[PDB]
Design a protein around this ligand. Structure first.
Ligand SMILES: [Fe+3]
Ligand SMILES: [Zn+2]
Length: 220
């Protein structure tokens, strides 16, 4: 009885997709990703949890005359990679970093068909940039930058109100990673976190503070 997949326009050529899962203890949790338009083509930034919602998402944009050109997953957790199986099965190119695919493989999960590495990677030159700030929420977490709109998708790295699930986190590295991110994208107009409302560049500073706070609490 989960809430329906939601698709809402955020800016010119940029949509937020929201899907939901049950997390025992915290109840239903919304997960935000993006869909970015490049001319008459669409790129998924993270996938929904399920094949079903991934298909609904894909069909929504196909039906509006956009070809799905690919998806990129910001980290290996299922809230970013849930639709990779379905997308691969439809021969839609999927993208994840080398680290992410290696974590998927280790966990017995289907991998993205295309991978990349390095600090900066242009999924679409001058339109969609993937940035690796270093380990934080997970060892592999990346963010996605849309220069034309100055929109940053933070995935699960951006945690302005609390760090959340620490199971796969690197609390020792997160502050340095968050410092690097804030310096890189301080001119962001909009910052889009995975589990809360859209904000501005202040979310970068808040994340840094939470990360610093988390590390201090771990050492005491
Ligand atoms: Fe995660
Ligand atoms: Zn998450």
């Amino acid at each position: 009885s989960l809430p329906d997949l939601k698709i809402e326009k955020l800016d010119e050529g940029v949509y937020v997709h929201t899907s939901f899962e049950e997390v025992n203890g915290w109840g239903v949790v919304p997960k935000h990703g993006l869909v970015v338009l490049v001319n008459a083509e669409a790129y998924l930034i993270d996938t929904p949890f399920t094949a079903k919602d991934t298909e609904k998402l894909v069909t929504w944009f196909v039906e509006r005359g956009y070809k799905i050109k690919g998806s990129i997953s910001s980290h290996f957790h299922s809230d970013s990679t849930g639709g990779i199986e379905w997308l691969n099965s439809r021969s839609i190119p999927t993208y994840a970093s080398e680290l992410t695919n290696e974590l998927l493989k280790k966990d017995g999960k289907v991998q993205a068909t295309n991978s990349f590495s390095g600090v900066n990677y242009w999924l679409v030159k001058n339109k969609i940039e993937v940035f690796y700030p270093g380990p934080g929420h997970t060892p592999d977490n990346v963010v996605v930058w849309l220069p034309e709109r100055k929109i940053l998708f933070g995935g699960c790295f951006i945690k302005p109100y609390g760090l959340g699930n620490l199971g796969d986190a690197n609390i020792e590295a997160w502050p340095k990673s968050a410092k690097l991110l804030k310096s890189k994208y301080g001119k962001a107009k909009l910052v889009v976190p995975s589990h809360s409302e859209v904000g501005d560049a202040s979310l970068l500073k808040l994340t840094l503070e939470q990360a610093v706070k988390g590390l201090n609490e771990s050492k005491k």
